[PDB]
């Protein structure tokens, strides 16, 4: 597992948090 | 921790993003 | 990072998916 | 990948779970 | 927002429809 | 809460508007 | 969609029910 | 369910309240 | 306005029709 | 109260007007 | 249509009944 | 039932009151 | 004006007709 | 009181006028 | 037609009856 | 029954009173 | 003038006719 | 009193006038 | 014809009866 | 019976009174 | 003048005729 | 008294006049 | 003819009877 | 019987009285 993978996971979570905040 | 684990995590996030987009 | 950490992360995602399915 | 990264991921999930519980 | 809220809204509408039908 | 619920609510309102227009 | 929205919808319905009861 | 749906529901209620006030 | 009001109006008219028929 | 009620009231008035015109 | 309208109609009928009783 | 209906009813009553006053 | 009044008028006329027939 | 009553009264008066004219 | 009219008619008849009784 | 009828009746009575006064 | 008056007049004439017939 | 009575009176007077003219 | 006329006629007859009784 | 009849009767009596006064 | 007077006159004439017949 | 009586009286006088003329 | 005439006639006859009784 | 008859009778008596006065 590489650093760039966890970043991409973290970045998805961020975009999921923002979507819920628009519900 | 192996690569296939983070993929499965990433893949779940994807299916969570899609579900919220149908709310 | 240890295996048990990614499992706990995966398990949280699971419980988040189920909550959204009850919205 | 370091321990502090998975913690930050876990912590985001936590704050996402709480937001959905307020929907 | 939870399921029980939309039900209570739907149930009010129902009782409003019935009242108008008695006018 | 799912999309089909708000539709059913919207559809009831529609039939309530039409009933009042016949008073 | 937030909780305060469905409340405002519910509250309008309430004031509509009361108006019809004065017809 | 999206924000624009509850608005459209709220807006219908408004036009229903106004119609009853003309009875 | 309620159903019982229009009935009472209709019933008065009836008793007015009968009175004129005795003139 | 329904449309057909006010019509029946209006129709009675009509027949009362005609009776008085024969006095 | 409002309550005060049917009252005013009912009140006119009353004064019409009384006039006929003086014929 | 609409406002214009009760007005037309009220207006007929008026013309009935005037006719009786000419008897 | 009531029925019994015109009868009393008619009845007087009758008794006037009979008186003239005795002149 | 009906039209036919006043006619019968008027008709009696007529026959009373004619009788006096033969005195 | 008003009550006072039939009275005046009745009163004339009375004075006609009395005149014939003096013939 | 109309006003003009009772007048015509009253007017006949008048002409009957005058005829008797010439007997 | 009453019937009994003209009879009394007629009866006097009769007794006058008889008196002249004895002249 | 009827016309035929005064005629019979007048006719008697006539026959009385004629009798005196033969004295 | 009035009462005072027949009296005056009756009174003349009386004075005619008395004159014949002096022949 | 009319006024002119009793006058003609009265006038005959007058001419009968005058004839007797010439006997 | 009465019948018995002319008889008494006639009777005197008779007794005058008889007296002359004795001259 | 009748005409034929005075004639019979006149006729007696005539026959009395003639008797005296023969004395 | 009046009473005083027949008396004067009767009185003449009387004076004629007395004259013949002196022949 | 008329005045002129008794005069003619009276006048005859007069001429009878005068004739006797010449006997």
Author numbering:
A (entry chain A), B (entry chain A), C (entry chain A), D (entry chain A), E (entry chain A), F (entry chain A), ...: 1 to 23
Task: Please give sentences taken from the publication describing this entry.
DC-SIGN (dendritic-cell-specific intercellular adhesion molecule 1-grabbing nonintegrin; CD209) and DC-SIGNR (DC-SIGN-related receptor, also known as L-SIGN and variously designated CD209L and CD299) are glycan-binding receptors of the immune system. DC-SIGN is expressed on dendritic cells and some types of macrophages, while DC-SIGNR is expressed on sinusoidal endothelial cells and in the placenta. Although each of these receptors binds mannose and related monosaccharides, they have differing specificities for oligosaccharides and for surfaces of microorganisms. Both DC-SIGN and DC-SIGNR bind high mannose oligosaccharides found on viral envelope glycoproteins and can participate in viral infection either directly by facilitating viral entry into a target cell or indirectly by presenting viruses to target cells. The CRDs in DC-SIGN and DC-SIGNR tetramers are projected at the ends of extended neck regions formed from a series of conserved but not identical sequences of 23 amino acids.
Further truncated forms were generated by removing the N-terminal non-repeat region or by removing this region and the first half of the first repeat unit. Gel filtration suggested that the purified truncated fragment is tetrameric, and differential scanning calorimetry demonstrated that it retains the stability of the full-length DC-SIGNR neck region, with a melting temperature of 81.7 °C compared with the measured value of 80.1 °C for the full-length neck. The structure was determined by multiwavelength anomalous dispersion phasing using crystals soaked in Pb(CH3COO)2. Within the unit cell, four molecules interact around the crystallographic 4-fold axis to generate a four-helix bundle. The four-helix bundles are translated by various numbers of repeats along the c axis throughout the crystal. This arrangement produces a unit cell with an asymmetric unit one repeat long that is an average of six nearly identical repeats. The model was further refined in Phenix to 2.2 Å. Completely conserved residues were given occupancy of 1.0, and side chains at the non-conserved positions were built with occupancy assigned based on their frequency in repeats 2 through 7: proline with occupancy of 0.83 and serine with occupancy of 0.17 at position 1 as well as glutamate with occupancy of 0.17, glutamine with occupancy of 0.33, and arginine with occupancy of 0.5 at position 15, resulting in the final refined model described in Table 2. The structure of the neck unit representing repeats 2 through 7 of the neck of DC-SIGNR is predominantly that of a four-helix bundle. The sequence of amino acids in the helical portions of the repeats follows the expected heptad pattern, with hydrophobic amino acids at the a and d positions. These hydrophobic residues are positioned toward the center of the bundle and pack against one another.
